[model samples]
Target: ATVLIVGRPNVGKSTLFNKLVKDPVQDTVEWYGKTFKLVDTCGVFDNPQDIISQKMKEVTLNMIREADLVLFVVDGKRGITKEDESLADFLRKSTVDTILVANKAENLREFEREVKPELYSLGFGEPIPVSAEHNINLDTMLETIIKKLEEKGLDLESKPEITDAIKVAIVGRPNVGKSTLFNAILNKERALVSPIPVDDEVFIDGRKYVFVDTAGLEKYSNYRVVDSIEKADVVVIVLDATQGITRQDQRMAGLMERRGRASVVVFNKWDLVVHREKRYDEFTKLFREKLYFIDYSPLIFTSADKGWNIDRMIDAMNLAYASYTTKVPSSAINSALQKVLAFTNLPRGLKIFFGVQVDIKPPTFLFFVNSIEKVKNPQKIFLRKLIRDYVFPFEGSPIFLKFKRSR
Candidate 1:
């Protein structure tokens, strides 16, 4: 069973969600021996005219339609707006059980005096007044929700251990079709797609994904952008094909490299780039050579407007995530390394004794070598390629090579 939170912008839906679930968007809360998934939703804007607002409304509605319970949050300070009424009408028509939560009720007495009576007309029962910021009446709110679930006869099963959802942060310089591609992946308009970011929980190929549409990163100065990428499982760097790769693009790529994050390079606006096999080949070559460090990163030609290769983008994200967390046995690492030694010669005074995968999640290998000093850049690059070619396909993910001198 899923509980969704919905409302117009900035009614503390996210605050309420965090107060309940803590973190990991799909968190299971154990309330009086009953467990259910709690999900946060994008703010729903009624009469959405712009692409971003319209998209957000669609995403929120989809979540509401599927949810078992909807927390219809509204501002206690600003009574009910036309948007709130519009949302109420939709919920009343739907079968999902809803709770009318009048948030920002720091002054409980003032809220009841001024606001709570007016919300009675919305017809979802009396509004539950609570202050998410002040942490007031939250327990009662949770108890109220659980009681509602019992009334609906929802079976509360044991909460399963929450697995880490693939966190893919879509990043790029401004106006490179980041928003277009974000909407394409979500299959809806969420935002014009951010230092102002939005996320959606989606199940694809029997796996959970939280697609984080981050602000278009122009410079490394934005600490928020840096923090966003740092927390991601994968980073999709959007590049405008018409303009080609810029210095900022390289900087963004470098940031991913420095952070050791899995990444996919997307060459967006392919429709404008002369859709010929030769042009595609030439452009791909240039893209690879430019970001040679991330040659392991998957390169995709996409037209977000046409929705070309969108599914392929998701596939790459999954593949990249698989490679990111993959752990190789010690025997398997040495077996692949032996094959590389048969055809390739090591530099003078440089010899690798054996290699073993010591870590994963951006899979890192600990290599016992004759000399860390003698292990040059050429050998590091060669070994990475050898591992990818012989072992697993580390596609769209960086492979870390750390050397410890064999005494």
Candidate 2:
């Protein structure tokens, strides 16, 4: 069920939402693996009651009417105003179940004495007093909502709190059809695709997913913001295959490596490339060699325009998610490592031993070696390839490997 938080502005509605969803404003939030698109309505005025511009008012109402539950928030510090009562009336007239909230209230008495008495006039029941910024009484509020839903038999399917799903980010320079690809996967135009960039979130088949449409990333030149790209389970770097990867494209891909995120290079605009000859295979080989990090990533040709291979992208996402969750039994790993050790002759003081998954969300393996410094870079790359090929479909997604010396 959808939970929509709405109210007069500056009531800490967004702050409350961020707390429930547990994502920084910069990151996307997911509920049951589905990101509920949040629309922060502008502040409503009191004087002669200037409603928002006609267009925006319609947008606000649409968001409200679409929600499963509406949090009708009011400023606790300021007490209820005539405008708030009017808004409450509007909410009551609508079919949406509203949970009345008094934000910034330190105690129920504050709500009971001031907000609640007048609040009763609105006919929605006692206001739920809360301090969204301070995070007080939220549990009670949430319990109330869940209990109400349960009473109505609106139970949701519960999943693991921590999922093995790879949170892949679709990133690229502008006009690469990132927005369209994102909407295709989520099946909604949730991502705003204007010349301006904005963030969006979606859920597919009970799996949680988030897509950051340009928004903050496109308008600025800050590297700290670029760091958000690292938190992804995998990074789908979209590029114009016909144009080949550009310097900016390579630079962004390099950044993905620094984040240690598994990479999926989407050579978008593929329909345009079929007219050209012999480029896809040659470009894939050259691109892989030019950037050795490419070994830890997969590249695909797709055209959102022609609706080609986009489903492959979705399948790849699910596969990569599963690979990140793949667990190897210790006995199986030891047996494989023994065969691997038998083929290799050790140098002086060099011993290859123990293995463990050092990290996931990209499924990184750390090999403990006695003389890690003596290991050649190519040897490391080769072993990574061997593991990736054996454990996961490198054609679909890459598994990352790291070598470390055990002291």
Candidate 3:
């Protein structure tokens, strides 16, 4: 069950998700032998008056459907406002269960007073009072949350969402050796008899690789390929070497690049292309020229029919997967950012405060700048390359950059 914090902005009210304001922050909380996802939502303002507020409401509502529980927050100091009543009314009509969080209370005395009448009027049962700044009664709040979750049939021993194994999605145009390659990779995992030959899930080198093939969904190849990419940690874009990069091949490659999944470009039917002049260089240059976006992707030539370079392909997949999930600390990012900023010419009077790696898995970064408008696309590209060359070789992974205006 996903638990989301929902509310309008209040004085000294923000806690936990102070780092990123625009984004709906997410983090896992472990308590009392249970692990569950805790979501931090953007503000639910007065009405559909502001554009960003409207967007936030839409996002909050969208998350509510998936949410089993929502922590409805209000200021205990100020009592209930029109915003609280409106939100409470909305929740009254909604089916999802809610826990009213009467925040910014002074110990249990003010907390009791606020809860006895102020919060109770909102209609949601028994508001838990907690001073987020002082960290008062938060544990009690957690216990209450757990109690409610248990009553609602959520597993008492809920596990973290993190998966230990790599999820690989093999996608390309139909008949481009997608099935053949799937078999070759699956058989390489184990020697035992696993029916259908291709293990959708197979273990190799003491690590598991969960593979998703583009089949059984639809007649449209792009739509089918798009479906597979959804559940994938790494994508293997298959290309027929003899036929070279066709229109469908280009479209598929473009889609994969746009999707931002860690990928390895596989030039299959290599046996046919092996005898031809320029082989690797020919295809490499051609691919670079065609799909310039995925230049960092490892291009491995393979004969899936003859099981050629299958081991190397697996190695590439692991490396790409490793690069995709790289985590960088703020210390390294800030230092590297300074070095990158030093040699580059700046937009006049623009100041950059610092940089930090906020998230992973297609590695997202946040930069504190004087003005986000001054940061051009080329500068963003330069910063990305700087991080790539200096920080981490985020090979086969797309880097996301976000700017926050600072003092």
Candidate 4:
């Protein structure tokens, strides 16, 4: 079950959500032996006119539709505004269970006397007043939310099992056919099965993988794409085969490298280039030269129209995810560091002591060295290549290395 928090801008919905879930993004919260998926959304605009605002409205509406319960937060201090009334009208039309929340209830007297009375006309009944910042009456608010969830039979006894599924984000510049590819994959994956919703999720091959068709990333402004990338286990950077890679495409691919995200470079409209003699070699060279920062990522030539190489894309995603989540034993890491030292020409006084796998999901490693200054970018790159060649070869994923001065 999904519980979505929605409200007008600056209404403390995100704040309350952060407090409740203790996570800034989407998370499963357990309360009273029941688990529920909780999501925080962008503030809803009553009548969005511009492109960005309109897109926000679209995303918020999708979340609302998928939610089993909606927490309609209103500013307790300000009572009700025209936007709140507009949001109320929107929510009233939907059959989803909504609980009115009078946020900023540290001013309890004003909330009980003024804000609570104004909420009744919204037709959702009593507004549970709580101060998300000051932490007043939050227990009561949670209790009320839990009771409402129980009434709707939406509570779960335990958290969902962790899955090995890969979460892939399809991202690219506009007109690169990301949406087309997304539709094709979904159709192929769920052709015979009915649409299933496990806390706003769908699975592939019994694995609870998620595919996010991210907004077309533009040059200057694309926060949504960044947010999607952070949540993804794998990122598919779509490129137009006919047009080749653009500067924006390079920037997007560079972002994957910088974020240490596991990724796949999919050359869409491959049908356009397939007929040409020696096209694969030429295109592959050009793609590699331009996106050398993401050279670790696997490249696939695909035609979303013909549905060519869709299965290969899926396999690449699964493999990349496995590589991203792969854990290297300390012994293996140390042995690989020895191999790296053997091959690499280390600068004077740059002797490395040892290394360990500090984390996974883009597999970070910390190395103790005689001097941090000696381990420059070039040395780091060489060390990474050595690790990939000798030790844990993380296919399609960036490995992060940190050099600390050994005492």
Model 1, span 236-274: residue lDDT tens: 888999999988788778889878999889999988887
- Cα deviation in Å at residue 189, candidate 3? 5.5
Q: Compose the digit string of candidate 3's lDDT tens values, residues 11-84.
A: 33348333112111454567755865565544432342333555445543543555678788888787788878
The positional error of residue 320 in candidate 3, measured at the CA in angstroms, is 1.4
- Candidate order by TM-score, decreasing, is 4, 3, 1, 2
**What would the per-residue lDDT of candidate 2 be over residues 229-251, giving only the tens digit for each residue?**
76676677787776776887777
Q: Which 10-residue window of candidate 2 scores lowest in summed lDDT?
A: 39-48
In angstroms, the error of model 4 at 326 is 0.2
Per-candidate Cα lDDT values, in order, are 0.75, 0.61, 0.70, 0.74
- Candidate 3 worst ten-residue window by lDDT: 16-25
Summing lDDT over every window of 10 consecutive residues in candidate 4, give the lowest-scoring window: 191-200
For model 3, the local distance difference test gives 0.70
lDDT, candidate 3, residue 197?
52
- Rank candidates by lDDT, best first: 1, 4, 3, 2
Residue-pair clashes per prediction, in order, are 5, 3, 0, 0
